[PDB]
């Protein structure tokens, strides 16, 4: 119950910032644009320098227009709202938000370890132990997130940033929604998508549970349990609920996955009575000190290495596209509350 007690204070805290969110906390002029750190479906993430403090940050830039044409208004407002309110060790910290004629911005804490992905891809696979360590932190993160009526919707190695201490940082909240009850938007990353989503059934918190299981699998095996060259081909597999585990997985891991990768909601771990505790209590997580993990007192099995302040060596190289600002304020009514 130290949890049930902890979250209580968590909730209270979230509620407040949720009702009274932060608006226009800065201006482009205070920032020095360095390199592109990465890309997403709605915009780019650049490495930034804060002139006066001398701090570097990752800055999420969105083009008012693109968001509109792609219909991401609600989602974009959702992301800043929710982000500016949460507070957990495994989620990125947003520091400044603000807009201008042309774009929307989100200044976040710069996580230099680079993406989980890049490392995952390089190394090949993760030792179940190395996996667990990461898992465990997503397990805790969902626990917090969910208790706030929040739904993540985009877990994928590409969104899991490795920090100076080799701990996770979940970035990109663009599909995260505060929602009591069912939701219906079709969004996410194909490989991670839950069946209920594809099938357009209306879905809940449990989708986040399925992605966890896809995550653990991609972590420990080297590939996703459902892959093909076109998303469609992927979809058919997901709804197929037919999964092959590598000969190298423990009977334990298999067990977990089978339950997370459950096509049936009234049967999928995470969505049951005991809720999370079905997961946390799993034999797989037998050697897990949830506290130490939370406390960031655990054994970082791997520590990316950062040369200096503003080192973009754990990130790929991107093409640079000049960001401009219209002398005409665009799409202002749609973004009143940003």
């Amino acid at each position: 119950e130290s949890v049930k007690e902890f979250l209580a204070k968590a909730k209270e805290d979230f509620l407040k910032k949720w009702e009274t969110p932060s608006q226009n906390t800065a201006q482009l002029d205070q920032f020095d644009r360095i390199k592109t750190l990465g890309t997403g479906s709605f915009g780019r993430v650049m490495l930034v320098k804060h002139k006066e403090s001398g701090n570097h940050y990752a800055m999420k830039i969105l083009d008012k227009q693109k968001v509109v044409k792609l219909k991401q208004i609600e989602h974009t407002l959702n992301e800043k709202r929710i982000l500016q309110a949460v507070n957990f060790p495994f989620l990125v910290k947003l520091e400044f938000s603000f807009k201008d004629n042309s774009n929307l911005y989100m200044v976040m804490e710069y996580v230099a370890g680079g993406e989980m992905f890049s490392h995952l891809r390089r190394i090949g696979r993760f030792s179940e132990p190395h996996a667990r360590f990461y898992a465990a932190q997503i397990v805790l993160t969902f626990e917090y997130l969910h208790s706030l009526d929040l739904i993540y919707r985009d877990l994928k190695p590409e969104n899991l940033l490795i920090d100076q201490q080799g701990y996770i940082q979940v970035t990109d909240f663009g599909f995260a929604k505060r929602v009591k009850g069912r939701t219906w938007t079709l969004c996410g990353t194909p490989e991670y998508l839950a069946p209920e989503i594809i099938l357009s059934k209306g879905y809940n918190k449990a989708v986040d549970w399925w992605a966890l299981g896809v995550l653990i699998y991609e972590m420990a095996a080297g590939y996703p349990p459902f892959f093909a060259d076109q998303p469609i081909q992927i979809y058919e597999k997901i709804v197929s609920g037919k999964v092959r585990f590598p000969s190298h997985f423990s009977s334990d891991l298999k067990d977990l996955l089978r339950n997370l990768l459950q096509v049936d909601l009234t049967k999928r771990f995470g969505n049951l009575k005991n809720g999370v505790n079905d997961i946390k209590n799993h034999k797989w997580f037998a050697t897990t000190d949830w506290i130490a993990i939370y406390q960031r007192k655990v054994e970082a099995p791997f520590i990316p290495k950062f040369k200096g302040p503003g080192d973009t060596s754990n990130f790929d190289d991107y093409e640079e596209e000049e960001i401009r600002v219209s002398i005409n304020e665009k799409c202002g009514k749609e973004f009143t509350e940003f």
């Binding site: 990465g38 479906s41 219909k71 985009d154 994928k156 990353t189 490989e191 080297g222 590939y223 092959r244």
Partner: peptide, 20 residues
């Protein structure tokens, strides 16, 4: 090998999210 199958595949790079 599946791994073998995965590497030749078209989605080994960074995966974009789907709007619609």
């Amino acid at each position: 090998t599946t791994y073998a199958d995965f590497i030749a595949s078209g989605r080994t790079g960074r995966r974009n999210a789907i709007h619609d």
